[PDB]
Amino acid sequence: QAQATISFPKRKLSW
DNA sequence: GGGTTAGGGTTAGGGTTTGGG
């Protein structure tokens, strides 16, 4: 639950 | 525009992972 984010790989994220 | 992932797009919710705000 505390790790639901993650921030999927190169996908719009942190250009 | 901008923020975890962070930009765009219009739209306020959506959308690669995604909800607002």
CA/C1' separation A8–B10 (Å) = 25
d(CA A11, CA A7) in angstroms, rounded, equals 8
**Residue A5: CA atoms inside 13 Å, Cβ hemisphere, count?**
3
Contacts of A4 (CB under 8 A, 6+ apart): none
Contact A6, A14 (CB under 8 A): no
d(CA A3, CA A15) in angstroms, rounded, equals 21
Q: Which residues touch strand B (CB under 7 A)?
A: A 5-9, 11-15
d(CA A13, CA A7) in angstroms, rounded, equals 7
CA/C1' separation A1–B15 (Å) = 22
**Nearest residue (CA) to C1' of B17:** A8
- Tokens linked to A11: 């996908």
Give the 3-state secondary structure percentages of chain A, helix then strand then coil, rounded to 5.
0, 0, 100
- Tokens linked to A13: 């994220």
Which technique was the structure solved with, according to the deposited record? NMR
